[PDB]
Amino acid sequence: FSCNVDGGSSIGAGTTSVYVNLDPVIQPGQNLVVDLSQHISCWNDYGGWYDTDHINLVQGSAFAGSLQSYKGSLYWNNVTYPFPLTTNTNVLDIGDKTPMPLPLKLYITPGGVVIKAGEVIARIHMYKIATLGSGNPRNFTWNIISNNSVVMP
Numbered sequence: 001f002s003c004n005v006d007g008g009s010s011i012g013a014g015t016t017s018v019y020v021n022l023d024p025v026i027q028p029g030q031n032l033v034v035d036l037s038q039h040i041s042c043w044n045d046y047g048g049w050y051d052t053d054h055i056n057l058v059q060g061s062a063f064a065g066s067l068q069s070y071k072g073s074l075y076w077n078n079v080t081y082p083f084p085l086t087t088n089t090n091v092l093d094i095g096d097k098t099p100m101p102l103p104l105k106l107y108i109t110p111g112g113v114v115i116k117a118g119e120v121i122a123r124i125h126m127y128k129i130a131t132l133g134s135g136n137p138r139n140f141t142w143n144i145i146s147n148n149s150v151v152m153p
Contacts, residue, residue, distance in 0.1 A: 001053045001094070001128055003042040003140065015141040022115065022146050025153065031072075032114070032150065034106035034122075040142065041099040049095035051132040057089040057104075058125035064143075067108065067121050074124075075105040083107070088127075106144065115150035 002010040005018055018039050026032060044053050056076075062084030063070055074083040077092045083106065094100055106122060108114075115121055122144040129135035 001042065001044060001130065001136075001138065003040060004099075005040055011140070013138040013140060015143060017120075017145050018142045019145050019147050021148060022150050024148050024150055026110070026114065026150060028110075028152055032108035032110070034108065034144065036104040036106065036142075036144070037101040040102045040104065042094060042102060043097055043099045044094045045097070047095070047097035051130050052093050052095035054129050054131070055092045055094060056127055057085060058127050059085050059088050061085045061124045062122065063108075064120040064123050066119055067115070071109050073107045075103070075107070077103045083122075110152065112152040113149065114152055115146045117146060117149045120145055 002012060004010055005016055018036065020034055020039060022032060022034065042055065044051070057074070062068070063072070072083040074081045074085065076089040079090050081089055092103065120143045124142040124144065126140040126142065128138040128140065
């Protein structure tokens, strides 16, 4: 099982920065959408659903810093969850060699500075376990970083 970010080199475990470009100016009350499907993809090395991998996001994943006071929601694989996660998300099955964009979106409800450029705005813990044997479990952490500032007028 492997993942990559923006077509980068394969990732087997660990913490990885995921850089996003956001609307730099948002109005009061309007929600910020952070689409992550366009940035992170994962795949099964076998294919044919042989040793299918089970993937979920993990309880405790939350905003960082900063947006700790912010409330929001997280979309994962046909279910939306309050964010920060107080439970695990549902499990996504990956058993094809075809890279699968993570079905993942982050929704953020906000002086005028909402997001600071270059800061970690969310820490998303992802868990992997395979079907074969003990499962070879692996932990991933995606540190979501905005390339640009987002402000309110």
